[PDB]
Amino acid sequence: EEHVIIQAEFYLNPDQSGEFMFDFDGDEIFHVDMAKKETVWRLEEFGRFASFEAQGALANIAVDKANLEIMTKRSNYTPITNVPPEVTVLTNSPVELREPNVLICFIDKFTPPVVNVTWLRNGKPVTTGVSETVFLPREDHLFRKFHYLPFLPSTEDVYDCRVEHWGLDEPLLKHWEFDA
Amino acid sequence: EEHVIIQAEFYLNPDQSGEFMFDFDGDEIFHVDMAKKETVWRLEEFGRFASFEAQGALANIAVDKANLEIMTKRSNYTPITNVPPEVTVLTNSPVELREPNVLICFIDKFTPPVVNVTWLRNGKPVTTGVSETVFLPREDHLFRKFHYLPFLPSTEDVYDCRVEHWGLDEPLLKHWEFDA
Amino acid sequence: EEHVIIQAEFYLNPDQSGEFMFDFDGDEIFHVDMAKKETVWRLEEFGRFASFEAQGALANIAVDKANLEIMTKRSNYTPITNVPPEVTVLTNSPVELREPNVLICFIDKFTPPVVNVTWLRNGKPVTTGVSETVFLPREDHLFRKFHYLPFLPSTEDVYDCRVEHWGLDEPLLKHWEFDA
Amino acid sequence: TRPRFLWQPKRECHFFNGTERVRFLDRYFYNQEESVRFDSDVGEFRAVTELGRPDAEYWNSQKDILEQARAAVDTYCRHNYGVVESFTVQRRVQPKVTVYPSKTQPLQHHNLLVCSVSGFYPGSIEVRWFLNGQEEKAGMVSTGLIQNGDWTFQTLVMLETVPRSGEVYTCQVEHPSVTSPLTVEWRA
Amino acid sequence: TRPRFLWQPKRECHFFNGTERVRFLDRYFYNQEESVRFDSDVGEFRAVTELGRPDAEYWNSQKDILEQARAAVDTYCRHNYGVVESFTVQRRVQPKVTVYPSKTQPLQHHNLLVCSVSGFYPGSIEVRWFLNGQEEKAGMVSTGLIQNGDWTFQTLVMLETVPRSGEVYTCQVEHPSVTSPLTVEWRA
Amino acid sequence: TRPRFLWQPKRECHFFNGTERVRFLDRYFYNQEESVRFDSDVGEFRAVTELGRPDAEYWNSQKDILEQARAAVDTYCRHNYGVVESFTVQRRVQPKVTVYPSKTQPLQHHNLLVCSVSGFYPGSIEVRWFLNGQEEKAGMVSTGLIQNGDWTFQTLVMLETVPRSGEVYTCQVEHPSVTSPLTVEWRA
Amino acid sequence: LAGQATTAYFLYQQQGRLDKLTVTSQNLQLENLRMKLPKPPKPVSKMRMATPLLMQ
Amino acid sequence: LAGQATTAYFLYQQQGRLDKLTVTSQNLQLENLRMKLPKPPKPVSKMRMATPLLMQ
Amino acid sequence: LAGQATTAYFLYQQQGRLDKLTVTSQNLQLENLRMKLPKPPKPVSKMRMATPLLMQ
Longest dimension (CA), chain F: 74
Q: Where are the alpha helices (DSSP H) in B48-167?
A: 54-74
Residue E178 domain-assigned? yes
In angstroms, the separation between the Cα of residue I36 and the nearest Cα of chain B is 9
Residues of C near B (Cβ–Cβ under 8 Å) read: 127-128, 130
Domain edge (last residue) among D48, D64, D89 = D89
What are the residues whose beta carbons fall under 8 Å from the beta carbon of B83, sequence distance 6 or more?
B109, B110, B111, B142, B167, D32
Contact E125, E181 (CB under 8 A): no
CB distance C45–A130 less than 8 Å? no
Q: Which of residues 3-32 of A touch I (CB under 8 A)?
A: 7, 9, 22, 29
Contact D149, B133 (CB under 8 A): yes
C-alpha E28/C-alpha E36 separation (Å) is 6
E141 shares a domain with E159? yes
Nearest to I3 by CA among A19, H8, G43: H8
Q: Which residue of I has its CA nearest to F65?
A: I53
Nearest to B3 by CA among B31, B27, B20, B19: B27
F173 shares a domain with F139? yes
- What residues of C are in contact with residue E86 (Cβ under 8 Å)? 49
C-alpha E178/C-alpha I54 separation (Å) is 57
D108 shares a domain with D32? no
Handedness of CA D109, D110, D112, D117 (dihedral sign): positive
Q: DSSP class of residue D75?
A: I
| Resolution number, Å | 3.0
Is the peptide bond between D9 and the residue preceding it cis, with omega within 30 degrees of 0?
no
Residue D49's CATH number: 3.10.320.10
Distance of CA E97 to the CA centre of its chain: 19
Whether chain H has a CB inside 8 Å of the CB on E63: the answer is no
Q: Which of G29, G38, G41 sits opposite C100 (nearest CB)?
A: G29
A 10 A CB-CB count for C116 gives 10
Nearest to G25 by CA among D110, B74, H20: H20
Nearest to E127 by CA among E149, E143, E110: E143
Residues counted in chain I: 56
C-alpha B157/C-alpha B173 separation (Å) is 15
C-alpha D10/C-alpha G52 separation (Å) is 11
**By CB neighbour count within 10 A (0-12 exposed, 13-18 middle, 19+ buried), where does D118 fall?**
buried
A 10 A CB-CB count for I21 gives 20
Encode G11-39: b = buried (16+ Cβ within 10 Å), e = exposed. beebeebbeebbebbbebbbbbbbebbbe
Specify the number of domains making up chain F: 2
What are the residues whose beta carbons fall under 8 Å from the beta carbon of I42, sequence distance 6 or more?
A47, A51, B35, B36
- What residues of G are in contact with residue C131 (Cβ under 8 Å)? 37-40
C-alpha A126/C-alpha A123 separation (Å) is 9
Q: Which residue of D has its CA nearest to B82?
A: D4
- SS3 of chain F: CCCCEEEEEEEEEEEECCCCEEEEEEEEEECCEEEEEEECCCCCCCCCCCCCHHHHHHHHHCHHHHHHHHHHHHHHHHHHHHHHHHHHHCCCECCCEEEEEECCCCCCCCCEEEEEEEEEECCCCCEEEEECCEEECCCCEECCCCCCCCCCEEEEEEEECCCCCCCCCEEEECCCCCCCCEEECCCC
Nearest to A150 by CA among A176, A175, A121, A130: A130
Amino acid at D80: N
Outline which parts of chain B fall under CATH 2.60.40.10.
86-176
The neighbouring-strand residues paired with A3 are: F15
Q: Which of residues 107-166 of F touch A (CB under 8 A)?
A: 116, 118-119, 121-123, 146-152, 154
Longest dimension (CA), chain H: 92
Contact F153, F162 (CB under 8 A): no
- Chains linked to D by 3 or more Cβ pairs within 8 Å: B, G
- What residues of G are in contact with residue H7 (Cβ under 8 Å)? 7, 11
Q: DSSP class of residue E181?
A: P
Q: Do chains D and H touch (3 or more CB pairs under 8 A)?
A: no
Contacts 24+ apart (CB under 8 A), E136-139: E136/E161, E139/E113
Nearest to A94 by CA among A106, A103, A107, A105: A103
Three-class secondary structure of residue B44 per DSSP: helix
Nearest to B99 by CA among B180, B12, B44, B174: B180
Strand pairing report for E127-131 and E170-173? antiparallel
CB distance A151–H30 less than 8 Å? yes
F59 shares a domain with F101? no
C-alpha B47/C-alpha B42 separation (Å) is 9
D109 shares a domain with D38? no
Nearest to I14 by CA among G21, B111, F74, E18: G21
Whether chain H has a CB inside 8 Å of the CB on C110: the answer is no
The neighbouring-strand residues paired with A32 are: A39
What are the residues whose beta carbons fall under 8 Å from the beta carbon of B151, sequence distance 6 or more?
B100, B101, B102, B103, B121, B157, B159, I30
Angle among Cα B50, B54, B59 to the nearest 5 degrees reads 140
Nearest to E155 by CA among E99, E106, E104, E90: E99
CB distance A45–B128 less than 8 Å? yes
Nearest to E84 by CA among C25, C20, A132: C25
What are the residues whose beta carbons fall under 8 Å from the beta carbon of G52, sequence distance 6 or more?
B9, B60, B63, B64, B67, D9, D11, D28
Whether chain E has a CB inside 8 Å of the CB on C48: the answer is no
Whether chain I has a CB inside 8 Å of the CB on F88: the answer is no
The neighbouring-strand residues paired with D114 are: D100, D158
Q: Cite the annotated binding site of E by residue number.
A: 55, 59, 79-80, 91
- Chains linked to G by 3 or more Cβ pairs within 8 Å: B, C, D, H, I
CB distance A60–I40 less than 8 Å? no
Angle among Cα C30, C33, C39 to the nearest 5 degrees reads 45
C-alpha F31/C-alpha G15 separation (Å) is 65
Method: cryo-EM
Q: Do chains H and A touch (3 or more CB pairs under 8 A)?
A: yes
Residue E1 domain-assigned? no
C-alpha B72/C-alpha B77 separation (Å) is 5
C-alpha H31/C-alpha A100 separation (Å) is 9
C-alpha H27/C-alpha E85 separation (Å) is 28
Contact A108, A140 (CB under 8 A): no
- Chains linked to C by 3 or more Cβ pairs within 8 Å: A, B, E, G, H
Contact C117, C106 (CB under 8 A): no
C-alpha A50/C-alpha I4 separation (Å) is 60
Q: Where are the alpha helices (DSSP H) in A44-168?
A: 44-47, 54-74
Q: DSSP class of residue D181?
A: P
Three-class secondary structure of residue B171 per DSSP: coil
Element (H, E) at D160: strand D153-160
Number of alpha helices (DSSP H) and beta strands (DSSP E) in chain I: 1, 0
C-alpha B61/C-alpha B15 separation (Å) is 14
Element (H, E) at C132: strand C131-132
Three-class secondary structure of residue A122 per DSSP: coil
Contact E67, E56 (CB under 8 A): no
Distance of CA C42 to the CA centre of its chain: 12
Dump strand ranges (E) for B38-171: 38-41, 86-91, 101-110, 116-121, 124-126, 131-132, 143-151, 159-164
Q: Which of A72, A81, A144 sits opposite F5 (nearest CB)?
A: A72
C-alpha B20/C-alpha C103 separation (Å) is 38
CB distance G54–B7 less than 8 Å? no
C-alpha A135/C-alpha A110 separation (Å) is 10
Q: DSSP class of residue E62?
A: S
Q: Which residue of F has its CA nearest to I47?
A: F80
Contact F172, F130 (CB under 8 A): yes
Three-class secondary structure of residue B46 per DSSP: helix
Angle between helices D63-72 and D53-61 in degrees, nearest 10? 100
Contact B39, B21 (CB under 8 A): no
- Chains linked to F by 3 or more Cβ pairs within 8 Å: A, I
**By CB neighbour count within 10 A (0-12 exposed, 13-18 middle, 19+ buried), where does C35 fall?**
exposed
Contact C73, C23 (CB under 8 A): no
Is F55 marked as binding a ligand?
Answer: yes
Element (H, E) at E135: strand E134-136
- What residues of A are in contact with residue C49 (Cβ under 8 Å)? 127
C-alpha B135/C-alpha B114 separation (Å) is 8
Encode A129-159: b = buried (16+ Cβ within 10 Å), e = exposed. bbbbbbbbbeeebbbbbbbbbbbbbeeeeeb
C-alpha B84/C-alpha B78 separation (Å) is 19
C-alpha D123/C-alpha B4 separation (Å) is 13
Amino acid at D29: F
Q: Which of residues 13-52 of F touch A (CB under 8 A)?
A: 13-18, 29-32, 51
Three-class secondary structure of residue A73 per DSSP: helix
- What residues of H are in contact with residue I31 (Cβ under 8 Å)? 32
E179 shares a domain with E114? yes
Contact I21, H18 (CB under 8 A): yes
- Chains linked to H by 3 or more Cβ pairs within 8 Å: A, C, E, G, I
Residue F2 domain-assigned? no
Q: Which of B7, B12, B166 sits opposite D1 (nearest CB)?
A: B166
Backbone angles phi, psi at C87, to 5 degrees: -115, 130
A 10 A CB-CB count for B99 gives 15
Q: Do chains C and I touch (3 or more CB pairs under 8 A)?
A: no
- SS3 of C102-127: EEEEEEEEEECCCCEEEEEECCEEEC
CB distance H46–C67 less than 8 Å? no
F128 shares a domain with F52? no
D139 shares a domain with D104? yes
Q: DSSP class of residue D31?
A: T
Contact G41, C35 (CB under 8 A): yes
Residue D16 domain-assigned? yes
CB distance C47–H46 less than 8 Å? no
Three-class secondary structure of residue B70 per DSSP: helix
Handedness of CA B80, B84, B90, B91 (dihedral sign): positive
Whether chain C has a CB inside 8 Å of the CB on H47: the answer is yes
Domain edge (last residue) among D70, D89, D108 = D89
Q: For B93, how many CA atoms within 13 A lie in the half-sphere containing its CB?
A: 16
Dump strand ranges (E) for chain A: 3-8, 11-13, 17-18, 21-24, 27-33, 38-41, 86-91, 101-110, 116-121, 124-126, 131-132, 143-151, 159-164, 172-176
Outline which parts of chain A fall under CATH 3.10.320.10.
5-74
**By CB neighbour count within 10 A (0-12 exposed, 13-18 middle, 19+ buried), where does I49 fall?**
buried
The neighbouring-strand residues paired with D12 are: D25
CB distance H55–E55 less than 8 Å? yes
A 10 A CB-CB count for E172 gives 17
Contacts 24+ apart (CB under 8 A), B57-62: B57/B9, B57/B20, B57/B32, B57/G49, B58/B20, B58/B32, B58/B34, B59/G51, B60/B9, B60/B20, B60/G49, B60/G51, B60/G52, B61/B9, B61/B11, B61/B18, B61/B19, B61/B20, B61/B34
Contact C85, C110 (CB under 8 A): yes
What are the residues whose beta carbons fall under 8 Å from the beta carbon of D159, sequence distance 6 or more?
D112, D113, D115, D129, D136, D138, D139, D140, D141
CATH class of C5-74: alpha beta
Whether chain I has a CB inside 8 Å of the CB on F169: the answer is no
Residue E180's CATH number: 2.60.40.10
Q: Which residue of D has its CA nearest to G52?
A: D9
Element (H, E) at E65: helix E63-72
The neighbouring-strand residues paired with E156 are: E116
Contact D15, B6 (CB under 8 A): no
Amino acid at F119: G
Whether chain A has a CB inside 8 Å of the CB on F106: the answer is no
Whether chain C has a CB inside 8 Å of the CB on G27: the answer is yes
A 10 A CB-CB count for D64 gives 7
C-alpha E34/C-alpha E56 separation (Å) is 12
Nearest to B149 by CA among B106, B85, B87: B106
H31, H36, H37, H43: CA torsion to nearest 10: 90
C66, C70, C76, C80: CA torsion to nearest 10: -40
What are the residues whose beta carbons fall under 8 Å from the beta carbon of B180, sequence distance 6 or more?
B94, B95, B96, B97, D100
**Order of strands, edge to edge, in the sheet holding A172-176?**
A124-126, A116-121, A159-164, A172-176
Strand pairing report for C116-121 and C159-164? antiparallel
Q: Which of B52, B64, B70 sits opposite G47 (nearest CB)?
A: B52
Ramachandran assignment for E25, one of left (phi > 0), alpha (psi -120 to 50 degrees), beta (any other): beta
Residue E18 domain-assigned? yes
Whether chain B has a CB inside 8 Å of the CB on D106: the answer is no
Residue D2 domain-assigned? no
Structural domain for D129, as ranges: 97-184
Element (H, E) at B3: strand B3-8
In angstroms, the separation between the Cα of residue F93 and the nearest Cα of chain A is 13
Backbone angles phi, psi at B123, to 5 degrees: 85, 0
C-alpha G36/C-alpha C42 separation (Å) is 10
D107 shares a domain with D34? no
User: What is the CATH number assigned to the segment(s) C86-176?
Assistant: 2.60.40.10
Which of F76, F85, F89 to substitute to test the interface with I, most I CBs within 10 Å? Answer: F76
Whether chain I has a CB inside 8 Å of the CB on B124: the answer is no
Whether chain I has a CB inside 8 Å of the CB on G26: the answer is no
Domain edge (last residue) among D59, D89, D119 = D89
In angstroms, the separation between the Cα of residue D47 and the nearest Cα of chain B is 15
Contacts 24+ apart (CB under 8 A), F89-93: F89/A1, F89/A3, F91/F121, F91/F122, F91/F151, F92/F121, F92/F175, F92/F176, F92/F177, F93/F119, F93/F120, F93/F121, F93/F152, F93/F177
Q: Do chains F and D touch (3 or more CB pairs under 8 A)?
A: no
What are the residues whose beta carbons fall under 8 Å from the beta carbon of B73, sequence distance 6 or more?
none
DSSP for D78-128, written as a single string:
IHHHHHHIIIIIS--B---EEEEEE-SSTTS---EEEEEEEEEBSS---EE
CB distance I41–B131 less than 8 Å? no
Encode H20-53: b = buried (16+ Cβ within 10 Å), e = exposed. ebbebbbebbbbbbbebbbebbbeeeebebbebe
DSSP for H3-14, written as a single string:
HHHHHHHHHHHH
CB distance H42–A35 less than 8 Å? yes
- Give the Å distances, CA to CA, from D18 to D83, D90, D92: 13, 11, 16
Nearest to B56 by CA among A112, C27, G51, C55: G51
